[PDB]
Amino acid sequence: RRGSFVEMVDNLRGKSGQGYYVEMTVGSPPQTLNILVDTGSSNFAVGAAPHPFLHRYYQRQLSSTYRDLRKGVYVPYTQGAWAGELGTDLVSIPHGPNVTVRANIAAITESDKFFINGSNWEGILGLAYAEIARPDDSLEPFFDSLVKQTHVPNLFSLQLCGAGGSMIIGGIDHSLYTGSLWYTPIRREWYYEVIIVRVEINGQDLKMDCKEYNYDKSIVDSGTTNLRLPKKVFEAAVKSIKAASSTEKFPDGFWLGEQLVCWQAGTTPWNIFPVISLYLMGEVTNQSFRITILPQQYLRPVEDVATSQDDCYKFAISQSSTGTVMGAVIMEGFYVVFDRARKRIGFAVSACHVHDEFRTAAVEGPFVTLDMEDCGYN
Amino acid sequence: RRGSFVEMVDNLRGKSGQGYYVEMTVGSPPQTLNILVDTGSSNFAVGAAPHPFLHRYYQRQLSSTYRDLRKGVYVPYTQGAWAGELGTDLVSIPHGPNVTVRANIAAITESDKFFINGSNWEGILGLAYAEIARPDDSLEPFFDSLVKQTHVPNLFSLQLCGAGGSMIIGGIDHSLYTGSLWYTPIRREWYYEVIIVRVEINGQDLKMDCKEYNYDKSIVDSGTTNLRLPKKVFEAAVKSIKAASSTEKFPDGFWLGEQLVCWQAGTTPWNIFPVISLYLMGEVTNQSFRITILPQQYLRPVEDVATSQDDCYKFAISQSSTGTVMGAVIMEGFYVVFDRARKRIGFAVSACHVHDEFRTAAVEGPFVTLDMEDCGYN
Ligand SMILES: CCCC[C@H](N)[C@H](Cc1ccsc1)NC(=O)c1cc(NC[C@H]2C[C@@H]2C)nc(N(C)S(C)(=O)=O)c1
Ligand SMILES: CCCC[C@H](N)[C@H](Cc1ccsc1)NC(=O)c1cc(NC[C@H]2C[C@@H]2C)nc(N(C)S(C)(=O)=O)c1
């Protein structure tokens, strides 16, 4: 019992619906806040004024090391947006690397549908690249500052445990996964973009041109709840899923995420729902691998109706007009390694993923897939 | 409710008999250890090999940032000694300042009567000056490294709570004391040396030449349990204390610290013991102030004989042949500010000191004391 990165294990709290967060200490004297881990954006920002949904916030006048950049910043997401003021300050991650850096920080002064009631986080850590940072790519993202200012290796890994988790910074911890790690190339450094080459529902190929799977783009986003799919792919996926779970019928609104379906405590018939496999481009020509998720991943729990014996679920696969988004529900079945140094993302079966005695999430390979380059949108 | 240094409040654990300690994280990846706060020495050192009394230790091969200085180091104390190897590594204090520095660190490989069974600490943080560091004054002490490498103000304060406490680094927290802070000059920067100019037992002057009080030297040491006094002063003090507590008699060994005396749970007659006042040189010519401690300070508790209703106490004033040592039992009644920047030490009544409904520890002034300069040993 030891593990070199042991102190970083279990440093995350939260859920797929409201977000996973890590503690970060900013300023001097110390001001610790809960920050959302978001690989789908690139700005580090913290609530800096009272808000109905915030238990605490960043108080710049109390930080002797805060430096005002005299520049406003506005960041819109798929869900919500906020306005703030830019500056820099000292930042450390108590349960992360043993270093302290001066990073850019956006003080959130106003917001619309950004903070989530009961989520317990007051800020957001955009872990993606400079290309998508606001106001522009000149605002160095936090991780870039970390790598340039310290000896911390240019890599971090995430293990999101559904119904906390771990964010290993600078390395990987072997106790967080089983089996082998399979890597897919980071196609371009802006979002953590990847390429999906095949999709199966219970082993059955969806039979869509792979270009549709990445139409526009496909990204790995810890800061988005669902597995979002382009319109045409969503429709085909839902039709196949319905056909594979015909043992029981559900309203159309369920598949659209507008209706919830509940079962008596501990009675959900996981067996009636199919597994979904996403094949990703590998690191060798014409070679791919696949990650398989269970209904325990794409059917997410929602607070009991009346604190009784009722497990309510929302279909966590939804439509998108901006490409595929492999969100938290997808990541919850695996240990995901964001190997920025080698421009690749690794996947391995998570040591904490939710499963049963009949099926488990899986990462298998290799498979033979030709013309994978053509799958990408230009 | 806020307090700028609020995150540092309550960052200490421990007791006067075994020591007060703070968490410190060393190396990369993070290795957190419990470290003894010692203002009576100047070396930062941590157990680096298994030991019967250690729950954990520093593993250098696991730290990528460790740098070997290829130099041995030996440090003897009044109580115990250890041998080790010098090097440097990254060091942060989780509940201290929001910075990380590269400091000298001694890896303890062998020791004799140093570590204390059940103390829960695995290292020691020497907070005194370079002059008394080992091997010599060229080995920069931790706090000096902190001040030179960061913007942290050159000052720290201690509130030791007897039967944890707080170590505020870079400032003072007003919630830790009541009344005013009175300062005494740091005579010379090696140990935290001060000058005692008068001593009273229940308001009665001990009537000894003040040179005897600082014969050799007088220091403030958070890493020593008792109030240690030069032989002649100890003898006079004990004689006066005995006379002032004549309502009940105790064996000679008690006053020598060789015998313990116990009372039924919650029955100790604190009222029969006198208060002790130490007058310290002030910051203005011919002006002094005094700190007064209660028997609750100089009579320290010792683990119940058989986990029952018996409060056992050991007389915490003892003899010394190396000058006066104002140890933890003395500090426990006050908030002590080690103002290195202004070469002075402040004292204020602690918001946590142990007292009763009849008496309280006190810090009062000013008083008129002539020829205080002559009190110091040359
Ligand atoms: C331009 C793209 C921005 C992508 C960033 N990842 C941004 C970060 C953010 C903003 C507000 S909370 C988190 N995320 C979202 O916009 C975002 C957050 C969440 N659900 C809340 C997420 C915390 C839990 C993981 N859900 C969605 N969906 C559309 S969903 C229901 O999953 O189909 C989108
Ligand atoms: C050359 C002077 C060195 C002074 C350093 N402060 C050094 C640090 C240290 C070493 C081993 S444990 C702590 N302290 C001691 O030598 C030391 C530690 C403790 N008791 C244990 C102390 C932790 C509790 C406060 N007691 C004493 N006394 C003689 S006593 C019973 O109070 O009369 C001395």
Swiss-Prot record, chains A, B:
GO CC terms, sorted? axon; cell surface; dendrite; early endosome; endoplasmic reticulum lumen; endosome; endosome membrane; Golgi apparatus
Q: How is its activity regulated?
A: Inhibited by RTN3 and RTN4.
Tell me where in or outside the cell this protein is found. Cell membrane; Golgi apparatus, trans-Golgi network; Endoplasmic reticulum; Endosome
Query: GO molecular function terms here?
Result: amyloid-beta binding; aspartic-type endopeptidase activity; beta-aspartyl-peptidase activity; endopeptidase activity; enzyme binding; peptidase activity; protein serine/threonine kinase binding
Record domain Peptidase A1: where: 20-348
Q: Does the keyword Coiled coil apply?
A: no
Induction pattern: Up-regulated by the Ca(2+)-regulated transcription factor NFATC4.
Enzyme Commission designation: 3.4.23.46
Q: What does this protein do?
A: Responsible for the proteolytic processing of the amyloid precursor protein (APP). Cleaves at the N-terminus of the A-beta peptide sequence, between residues 671 and 672 of APP, leads to the generation and extracellular release of beta-cleaved soluble APP, and a corresponding cell-associated C-terminal fragment which is later released by gamma-secretase. Cleaves CHL1.
Q: What is this protein called in UniProt?
A: Beta-secretase 1
Q: Which organism is it from?
A: Homo sapiens
Whole-protein residues included: 56 to 446 of 501
